[PDB]
Design a binder for these strands. Structure first.
Ligand SMILES: [Mg+2]
Length: 49
DNA sequence: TGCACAGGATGTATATATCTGACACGTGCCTGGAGACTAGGGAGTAATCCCCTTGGCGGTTAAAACGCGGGGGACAGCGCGTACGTGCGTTTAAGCGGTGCTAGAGCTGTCTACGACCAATTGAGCGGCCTCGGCACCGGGATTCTCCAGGGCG
Protein backbone atom coordinates (compact mmCIF):
# COMPACT_ATOMS: atom_id res chain seq x y z
CA UNK A 1 0.00 0.00 0.00
CA UNK A 2 1.05 3.61 -0.46
CA UNK A 3 1.07 4.83 3.15
CA UNK A 4 1.82 1.58 4.99
CA UNK A 5 4.64 -0.36 3.32
CA UNK A 6 5.47 1.91 0.40
CA UNK A 7 7.53 4.39 2.41
CA UNK A 8 10.58 3.16 4.35
CA UNK A 9 11.38 -0.44 3.44
CA UNK A 10 14.52 -1.89 1.81
CA UNK A 11 13.13 -4.31 -0.79
CA UNK A 12 15.63 -5.01 -3.58
CA UNK A 13 13.86 -8.10 -4.91
CA UNK A 14 11.45 -6.87 -7.57
CA UNK A 15 12.67 -5.57 -10.93
CA UNK A 16 9.32 -3.98 -11.85
CA UNK A 17 7.01 -1.38 -10.30
CA UNK A 18 3.31 -1.11 -11.20
CA UNK A 19 1.05 1.84 -10.31
CA UNK A 20 -2.72 1.41 -10.55
CA UNK A 21 -3.55 4.96 -9.44
CA UNK A 22 -1.46 7.97 -8.41
CA UNK A 23 -2.91 11.02 -6.65
CA UNK A 24 0.22 12.99 -5.72
CA UNK A 25 3.38 12.39 -7.75
CA UNK A 26 5.70 15.29 -7.21
CA UNK A 27 7.23 13.23 -4.40
CA UNK A 28 4.94 10.81 -2.56
CA UNK A 29 4.59 8.49 -5.56
CA UNK A 30 8.30 8.79 -6.40
CA UNK A 31 9.03 7.13 -3.04
CA UNK A 32 7.05 4.05 -4.12
CA UNK A 33 9.25 3.08 -7.06
CA UNK A 34 12.29 4.17 -5.03
CA UNK A 35 11.38 1.42 -2.58
CA UNK A 36 12.25 -0.96 -5.43
CA UNK A 37 15.40 0.65 -6.85
CA UNK A 38 18.03 0.38 -4.12
CA UNK A 39 21.74 -0.24 -3.57
CA UNK A 40 21.37 -4.01 -3.91
CA UNK A 41 19.81 -4.04 -7.39
CA UNK A 42 22.08 -4.97 -10.31
CA UNK A 43 19.21 -4.98 -12.84
CA UNK A 44 17.54 -2.05 -14.56
CA UNK A 45 14.17 -1.02 -13.12
CA UNK A 46 11.23 -0.97 -15.54
CA UNK A 47 8.48 1.19 -14.02
CA UNK A 48 5.05 1.12 -15.67
CA UNK A 49 1.92 3.18 -15.07
C1' DT B 1 -116.01 -46.22 80.91
C1' DG B 2 -113.75 -44.31 76.31
C1' DC B 3 -114.71 -40.49 73.17
C1' DA B 4 -115.74 -36.42 70.27
C1' DC B 5 -117.13 -31.37 70.68
C1' DA B 6 -118.08 -26.49 71.81
C1' DG B 7 -115.88 -22.83 73.55
C1' DG B 8 -112.16 -20.33 76.22
C1' DA B 9 -106.95 -19.21 76.66
C1' DT B 10 -103.27 -18.07 74.68
C1' DG B 11 -99.81 -16.54 69.53
C1' DT B 12 -98.91 -14.63 65.38
C1' DA B 13 -98.37 -12.93 61.22
C1' DT B 14 -101.09 -8.96 59.43
C1' DA B 15 -102.37 -4.14 58.80
C1' DT B 16 -102.34 0.65 60.68
C1' DA B 17 -100.70 5.00 62.94
C1' DT B 18 -96.16 6.86 64.32
C1' DC B 19 -91.00 8.41 64.79
C1' DT B 20 -85.92 10.05 62.24
C1' DG B 21 -83.49 11.49 58.12
C1' DA B 22 -82.75 13.23 54.15
C1' DC B 23 -84.22 15.56 49.87
C1' DA B 24 -86.50 19.81 48.18
C1' DC B 25 -87.73 24.88 48.06
C1' DG B 26 -87.70 30.12 49.58
C1' DT B 27 -84.37 33.94 51.32
C1' DG B 28 -80.69 38.35 51.57
C1' DC B 29 -75.24 40.28 52.70
C1' DC B 30 -70.86 39.21 51.46
C1' DT B 31 -69.36 37.61 47.33
C1' DG B 32 -68.94 38.28 41.96
C1' DG B 33 -69.61 41.31 37.26
C1' DA B 34 -68.53 44.99 35.12
C1' DG B 35 -66.80 50.12 33.73
C1' DA B 36 -62.75 53.43 33.40
C1' DC B 37 -57.30 55.03 34.14
C1' DT B 38 -52.76 54.03 34.32
C1' DA B 39 -48.02 51.66 32.38
C1' DG B 40 -44.75 48.68 32.65
C1' DG B 41 -44.33 44.05 31.21
C1' DG B 42 -44.87 41.30 27.06
C1' DA B 43 -44.59 40.65 21.76
C1' DG B 44 -41.39 41.78 17.86
C1' DT B 45 -37.08 42.87 15.43
C1' DA B 46 -31.62 43.85 14.20
C1' DA B 47 -27.23 42.19 14.26
C1' DT B 48 -24.14 38.63 16.28
C1' DC B 49 -20.84 35.20 17.21
C1' DC B 50 -19.89 31.22 18.45
C1' DC B 51 -19.34 26.70 19.12
C1' DC B 52 -21.08 23.18 16.30
C1' DT B 53 -20.92 20.43 11.92
C1' DT B 54 -20.05 18.02 6.56
C1' DG B 55 -18.03 13.50 4.11
C1' DG B 56 -14.75 9.96 3.80
C1' DC B 57 -10.55 7.71 2.84
C1' DG B 58 -6.05 5.17 5.44
C1' DG B 59 -3.40 3.19 10.12
C1' DT B 60 -3.44 1.65 14.61
C1' DT B 61 -4.90 0.65 19.11
C1' DA B 62 -8.01 -0.70 23.07
C1' DA B 63 -12.20 -2.38 23.75
C1' DA B 64 -15.83 -5.45 22.34
C1' DA B 65 -17.03 -10.35 20.84
C1' DC B 66 -16.69 -15.52 20.70
C1' DG B 67 -15.26 -20.24 22.44
C1' DC B 68 -14.38 -24.03 25.49
C1' DG B 69 -13.51 -26.56 30.66
C1' DG B 70 -15.68 -27.67 34.62
C1' DG B 71 -16.47 -26.44 39.39
C1' DG B 72 -19.21 -25.31 42.32
C1' DG B 73 -23.59 -23.72 43.33
C1' DA B 74 -28.62 -23.70 41.98
C1' DC B 75 -31.97 -27.03 42.41
C1' DA B 76 -35.13 -31.35 42.66
C1' DG B 77 -36.46 -35.28 46.26
C1' DC B 78 -37.54 -36.61 50.72
C1' DG B 79 -38.04 -37.43 55.87
C1' DC B 80 -38.79 -35.06 60.50
C1' DG B 81 -41.33 -32.52 64.47
C1' DT B 82 -42.73 -28.83 66.54
C1' DA B 83 -45.31 -24.63 65.54
C1' DC B 84 -48.97 -22.69 64.50
C1' DG B 85 -54.27 -23.99 62.51
C1' DT B 86 -58.56 -25.36 64.42
C1' DG B 87 -61.96 -26.06 67.97
C1' DC B 88 -64.11 -25.52 72.77
C1' DG B 89 -65.32 -22.75 77.58
C1' DT B 90 -64.30 -18.98 80.49
C1' DT B 91 -63.39 -13.46 81.48
C1' DT B 92 -62.47 -8.21 81.09
C1' DA B 93 -63.69 -4.78 79.13
C1' DA B 94 -65.31 -1.88 75.12
C1' DG B 95 -70.20 0.07 73.17
C1' DC B 96 -73.40 2.45 74.29
C1' DG B 97 -77.40 5.10 76.93
C1' DG B 98 -77.21 8.89 79.72
C1' DT B 99 -74.94 13.39 82.85
C1' DG B 100 -72.69 17.52 85.02
C1' DC B 101 -69.03 20.78 83.88
C1' DT B 102 -65.72 23.88 81.84
C1' DA B 103 -61.78 25.69 79.74
C1' DG B 104 -60.29 26.24 75.71
C1' DA B 105 -61.98 27.16 70.75
C1' DG B 106 -63.83 30.97 68.07
C1' DC B 107 -65.62 35.81 66.07
C1' DT B 108 -64.66 41.06 66.90
C1' DG B 109 -62.80 46.51 68.21
C1' DT B 110 -57.52 49.42 68.90
C1' DC B 111 -53.51 51.12 67.75
C1' DT B 112 -49.16 50.73 67.10
C1' DA B 113 -45.09 48.92 65.98
C1' DC B 114 -43.68 48.29 61.86
C1' DG B 115 -42.91 46.68 57.52
C1' DA B 116 -44.45 48.18 52.38
C1' DC B 117 -42.83 51.93 48.88
C1' DC B 118 -39.25 55.31 47.15
C1' DA B 119 -34.39 58.79 46.31
C1' DA B 120 -28.80 58.67 47.14
C1' DT B 121 -24.20 56.38 47.91
C1' DT B 122 -21.00 52.80 47.27
C1' DG B 123 -18.33 48.85 48.23
C1' DA B 124 -18.51 44.33 48.34
C1' DG B 125 -19.25 41.26 44.95
C1' DC B 126 -18.79 39.76 39.93
C1' DG B 127 -16.20 39.47 34.95
C1' DG B 128 -10.99 38.96 33.52
C1' DC B 129 -6.36 37.23 34.10
C1' DC B 130 -2.16 34.64 34.93
C1' DT B 131 0.53 32.34 37.40
C1' DC B 132 2.88 27.71 40.52
C1' DG B 133 2.20 24.21 44.07
C1' DG B 134 -0.69 20.67 44.61
C1' DC B 135 -2.04 16.91 41.62
C1' DA B 136 -1.69 12.79 37.84
C1' DC B 137 0.70 8.73 36.73
C1' DC B 138 4.12 5.41 37.23
C1' DG B 139 8.81 3.02 38.69
C1' DG B 140 11.25 0.49 42.98
C1' DG B 141 10.76 -2.32 46.32
C1' DA B 142 8.84 -4.57 50.29
C1' DT B 143 4.78 -6.99 51.79
C1' DT B 144 1.00 -9.82 51.84
C1' DC B 145 -1.98 -13.07 49.71
C1' DT B 146 -3.85 -16.74 47.50
C1' DC B 147 -2.93 -21.56 44.56
C1' DC B 148 -1.15 -25.95 44.19
C1' DA B 149 1.59 -30.35 45.58
C1' DG B 150 2.87 -33.85 48.98
C1' DG B 151 2.52 -36.79 53.37
C1' DG B 152 1.74 -37.56 57.45
C1' DC B 153 -2.07 -38.70 58.57
C1' DG B 154 -6.46 -40.75 58.88
MG1 LIG C 1 14.86 5.58 6.09
Amino acid sequence: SSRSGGLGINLTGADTVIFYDSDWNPAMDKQCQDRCHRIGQTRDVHIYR
